[PDB]
Amino acid sequence: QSLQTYVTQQLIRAAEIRASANLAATKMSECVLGQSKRVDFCGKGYHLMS
Amino acid sequence: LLQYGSFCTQLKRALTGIAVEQDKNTQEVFAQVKQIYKTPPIKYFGGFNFSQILPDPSKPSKRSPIEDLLFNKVTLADAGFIKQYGDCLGDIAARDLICAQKFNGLTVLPPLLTDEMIAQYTSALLAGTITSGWTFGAGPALQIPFPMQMAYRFNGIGVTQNVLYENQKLIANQFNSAIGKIQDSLSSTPSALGKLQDVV
Amino acid sequence: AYRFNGIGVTQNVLYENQKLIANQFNSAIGKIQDSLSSTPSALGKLQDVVNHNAQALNTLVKQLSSKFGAISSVLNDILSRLDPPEAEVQIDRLITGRLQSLQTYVTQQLIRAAEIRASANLAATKMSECVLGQSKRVDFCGKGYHLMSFPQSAPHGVVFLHVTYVPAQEKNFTTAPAICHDGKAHFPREGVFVSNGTHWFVTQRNFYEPQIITTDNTFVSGNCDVVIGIVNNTVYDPLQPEL
Amino acid sequence: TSNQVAVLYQGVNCTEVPVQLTPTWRVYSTGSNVFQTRAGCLIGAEYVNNSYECDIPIGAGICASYQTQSQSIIAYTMSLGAENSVAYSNNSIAIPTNFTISVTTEILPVSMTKTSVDCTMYICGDSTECSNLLLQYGSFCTQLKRALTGIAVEQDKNTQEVFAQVKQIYKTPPIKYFGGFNF
Ligand SMILES: *[C@@H]1O[C@H](CO)[C@@H](O[C@@H]2O[C@H](CO)[C@@H](O)[C@H](O)[C@H]2NC(C)=O)[C@H](O)[C@H]1NC(C)=O
Numbered sequence: 001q002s003l004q005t006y007v008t009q010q011l012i013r014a015a016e017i018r019a020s021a022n023l024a025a026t027k028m029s030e031c032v033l034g035q036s037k038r039v040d041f042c043g044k045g046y047h048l049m050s
Numbered sequence: 051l052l053q054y055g056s057f058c059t060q061l062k063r064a065l066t067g068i069a070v071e072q073d074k075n076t077q078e079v080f081a082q083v084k085q086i087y088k089t090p091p092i093k094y095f096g097g098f099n100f101s102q103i104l105p106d107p108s109k110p111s112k113r114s115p116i117e118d119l120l121f122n123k124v125t126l127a128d129a130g131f132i133k134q135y136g137d138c139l140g141d142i143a144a145r146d147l148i149c150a151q152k153f154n155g156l157t158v159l160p161p162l163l164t165d166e167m168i169a170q171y172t173s174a175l176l177a178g179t180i181t182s183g184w185t186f187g188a189g190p191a192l193q194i195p196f197p198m199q200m201a202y203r204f205n206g207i208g209v210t211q212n213v214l215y216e217n218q219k220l221i222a223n224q225f226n227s228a229i230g231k232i233q234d235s236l237s238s239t240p241s242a243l244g245k246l247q248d249v250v
Numbered sequence: 251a252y253r254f255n256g257i258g259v260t261q262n263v264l265y266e267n268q269k270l271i272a273n274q275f276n277s278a279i280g281k282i283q284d285s286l287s288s289t290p291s292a293l294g295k296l297q298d299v300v301n302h303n304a305q306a307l308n309t310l311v312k313q314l315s316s317k318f319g320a321i322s323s324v325l326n327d328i329l330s331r332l333d334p335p336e337a338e339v340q341i342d343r344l345i346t347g348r349l350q351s352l353q354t355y356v357t358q359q360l361i362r363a364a365e366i367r368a369s370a371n372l373a374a375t376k377m378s379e380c381v382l383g384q385s386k387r388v389d390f391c392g393k394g395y396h397l398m399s400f401p402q403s404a405p406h407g408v409v410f411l412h413v414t415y416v417p418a419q420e421k422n423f424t425t426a427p428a429i430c431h432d433g434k435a436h437f438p439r440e441g442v443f444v445s446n447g448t449h450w451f452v453t454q455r456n457f458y459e460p461q462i463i464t465t466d467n468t469f470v471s472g473n474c475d476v477v478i479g480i481v482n483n484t485v486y487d488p489l490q491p492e493l
Numbered sequence: 494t495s496n497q498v499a500v501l502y503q504g505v506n507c508t509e510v511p512v513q514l515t516p517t518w519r520v521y522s523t524g525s526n527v528f529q530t531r532a533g534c535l536i537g538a539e540y541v542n543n544s545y546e547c548d549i550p551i552g553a554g555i556c557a558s559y560q561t562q563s564q565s566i567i568a569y570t571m572s573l574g575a576e577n578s579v580a581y582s583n584n585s586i587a588i589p590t591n592f593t594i595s596v597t598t599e600i601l602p603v604s605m606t607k608t609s610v611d612c613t614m615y616i617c618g619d620s621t622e623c624s625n626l627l628l629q630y631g632s633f634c635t636q637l638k639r640a641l642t643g644i645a646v647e648q649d650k651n652t653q654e655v656f657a658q659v660k661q662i663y664k665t666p667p668i669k670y671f672g673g674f675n676f
């Protein structure tokens with residue numbers, strides 16, 4: 001039972017970390033390799049570069 | 051226990067899937083480009099100072115000062131290195147939790163990509179975005195002077211180029227001051243890097 | 251032509267190279283089937299989706315042969331070999347084990363369902379943004395400058411075909427930020443100043459098309475004592491010669 | 494391809510490798526088949542400075558592959574990419590003179606299989622005493638059925654959200670001519 005609980009918690013944390021990593025990859029693609037016009041996506045104000 | 055089914059096979063499969071997914075996430079994040087660009091030996095970009103983010107060749111690991119501060123701020127327990135059984139049998143009368151975990155069948159695996167490779171990827175991205183702008187992200191890299199690129203960016207945000215070309219020194223000084231304040235702001239705050247510490 | 255204007259290229263570039271663009275598009279479309287057929291592991295995600303469910307069901311079926319500490323894994327043998335007031339303690343272990351197996355299966359299914367829902371939401375956003383319009387987000391609807399996209403259906407999934415524009419055959423040139431003339435500084439409206447070695451022209455961004463420098467495509471808005479790196483040349487006024 | 498294998502002892506010094514072991518089989522070490530990585534000790538592979546793309550991950554920046562050199566198994570350090578260096582000057586620019594139309598593919602999953610489970614048949618089958626004993630264990634099976642039904646409904650919801658953007662069924666013209674574009 002202890003092993004099952006540990007594995008379930010690890011799986012949930014892995015899902016959360018994967019979501020965060022996907023967001024980070026999107027930010028890398030959109031804010032560093034180009035100029036973004038989305039509001040408050042690459043900082044506060046008018047984005048220039050990153 | 052042999053007659054209780056195959057739960058442990060499922061446990062091993064789930065753990066292996068998580069382990070593979072971690073490396074997949076790292077590769078997806080940090081491997082955007084497949085070319086290793088290099089910065090020019092002469093560091094002059096119209097008055098813009100990039101010394102705080104470019105790699106430092108003096109130190110062996112070739113990391114920028116900001117990266118040095120970031121790596122020194124975060125404390126890591128186990129890095130997946132070789133926690134040799136000899137170290138546990140050393141018997142220094144100070145039994146840590148790592149040896150207790152190891153003696154009960156729990157181990158930590160090292161990541162596929164080292165820190166040096168990630169630093170190399172970051173340096174390549176920085177060189178590409180400094181010497182070419184946004185051209186290298188959609189095809190071959192095209193050279194362009196930095197003030198002209200920043201004028202293009204100001205035109206993108208909705209300001210004419212003569213505004214930039216008549217205030218180059220002030221903009222450069224403001225950028226330099228803003229970059230310089232970043233290290234002090236990061237060092238002064240004790241709980242700036244809370245997310246990674248929580249993860250550990 | 252509207253799409254090329256959207257990505258930042260004038261329409262005359264399209265209208266003067268229609269046949270070449272059509273041939274390139276036809277060749278790129280034709281190569282897709284060969285590329286898909288040659289690769290053996292191209293459609294790995296859908297196959298993994300099928301295989302995970304198959305393996306989970308097979309494991310759930312296989313779990314029925316465990317004893318869980320009892321004397322047998324068959325209820326009929328226990329019923330026919332043991333005292334009815336005594337056989338209950340043997341059935342309890344089997345019931346508990348099978349319940350635990352069902353709980354594990356349900357939890358795994360829920361986690362996989364959450365992941366699949368996230369993937370489906372991403373696919374729906376891509377359908378809305380890349381197919382029904384032109385996207386300016388970098389590396390969202392392919393690599394390069396996005397033009398348009400085509401959807402196709404596949405078992406338990408979707409396939410997007412993105413069409414992109416990629417520059418090629420670059421050349422070196424000498425450039426200047428502004429042009430000095432009659433004590434006035436001139437900046438280009440759209441494009442960049444270019445020097446071929448002797449003369450100076452103005453061109454656009456992603457295609458080489460030199461033009462004679464004129465007051466029609468430049469604005470003064472300043473003086474000639476503050477811009478760093480200015481180069482002085484002649485600016486041609488169109489109306490003056492014809493009066 | 495081949496029946497050759499390589500062994501990796503995880504987190505073990507190569508000097509402390511055992512040569513009475515739990516596995517009956519043992520691999521004998523020669524002069525050049527022993528390598529030490531930050532992940533442990535590798536036996537049966539040869540190390541070179543030739544660098545390629547990663548084929549089989551091993552540890553911290555070390556990969557393995559099957560190469561003809563006589564075919565054998567080799568170990569190396571993964572290569573990040575091709576070296577490049579763009580010339581930078583403050584009075585020079587680069588401008589393209591031609592273009593290329595490219596087509597790329599992307600694959601995305603949408604839904605999965607919808608399954609249903611019967612508690613009485615799976616746990617007790619046709620037995621009546623087992624069903625009577627299970628009847629006093631609560632209402633877990635109701636929760637199981639509810640979760641399975643929710644997943645089943647969510648699959649169809651995902652498919653409908655993805656593939657039902659428009660509510661009009663358009664038709665292509667009978668004449669297929671679009672200025673030279675072949676669809
Ligand atoms: C860019 O900024 C850095 C950081 O301020 C400058 O490095 C300093 O240079 C001065 C003058 O040589 C030294 O007294 C400081 O000790 C340096 N600081 C550090 C942290 O090393 C650098 O000189 C600037 N670049 C240019 C071209 O002026």
Ligand SMILES: *[C@@H]1O[C@H](CO)[C@@H](O[C@@H]2O[C@H](CO)[C@@H](O)[C@H](O)[C@H]2NC(C)=O)[C@H](O)[C@H]1NC(C)=O
Nearest residue numbers: 444445446447448449450451452460461462463
């Ligand atoms: C740079 O462009 C100018 C303008 O097109 C070129 O000058 C032309 O040269 C050709 C060949 O000698 C002549 O037939 C034209 O009459 C010239 N035009 C003018 C307006 O004088 C010049 O040759 C180009 N530079 C180089 C190095 O090719």
Ligand SMILES: *[C@@H]1O[C@H](CO)[C@@H](O[C@@H]2O[C@H](CO)[C@@H](O)[C@H](O)[C@H]2NC(C)=O)[C@H](O)[C@H]1NC(C)=O
Nearest residue numbers: 269270271272273274277418419590591592593
């Ligand atoms: C731009 O690229 C296209 C594609 O390579 C070039 O078209 C080729 O031109 C050569 C020389 O005339 C022909 O032999 C090929 O058959 C053409 N290819 C196609 C697909 O038509 C085009 O010439 C290039 N533009 C310039 C100015 O060189």
Ligand SMILES: *[C@@H]1O[C@H](CO)[C@@H](O[C@@H]2O[C@H](CO)[C@@H](O)[C@H](O)[C@H]2NC(C)=O)[C@H](O)[C@H]1NC(C)=O
Nearest residue numbers: 276277279280281283669670671673674675676
């Ligand atoms: C569009 O492309 C298809 C595929 O190449 C063409 O179909 C071919 O037509 C030729 C000539 O009739 C046949 O010999 C081939 O067998 C056809 N291929 C297939 C796969 O059927 C089609 O003709 C093209 N459209 C136009 C208007 O030319």
Ligand SMILES: *[C@@H]1O[C@H](CO)[C@@H](O)[C@H](O)[C@H]1NC(C)=O
Nearest residue numbers: 419420421422423579580587
């Ligand atoms: C431009 O000049 C640089 C340095 O002379 C050279 O490396 C590069 O290849 C040139 N570009 C082209 C397209 O020839």
Ligand SMILES: *[C@@H]1O[C@H](CO)[C@@H](O)[C@H](O)[C@H]1NC(C)=O
Nearest residue numbers: 430432433474480481482483
């Ligand atoms: C034109 O540019 C040259 C080169 O810098 C300079 O010597 C000359 O004085 C300029 N002409 C005028 C009228 O200032």
Ligand SMILES: *[C@@H]1O[C@H](CO)[C@@H](O)[C@H](O)[C@H]1NC(C)=O
Nearest residue numbers: 132134506507508509529531
């Ligand atoms: C392996 O053992 C030797 C024994 O002297 C030691 O020098 C070496 O550092 C050890 N290596 C590791 C990775 O622990």
Ligand SMILES: *[C@@H]1O[C@H](CO)[C@@H](O)[C@H](O)[C@H]1NC(C)=O
Nearest residue numbers: 525539540541542543544570
């Ligand atoms: C591999 O490269 C290292 C680094 O220069 C060198 O010292 C070593 O001799 C090389 N080994 C072989 C077998 O060539």
Ligand SMILES: *[C@@H]1O[C@H](CO)[C@@H](O)[C@H](O)[C@H]1NC(C)=O
Nearest residue numbers: 090092094096581582583584
């Ligand atoms: C940048 O401009 C300066 C003028 O102060 C010049 O000395 C330097 O050579 C230029 N850079 C390059 C790479 O030529």
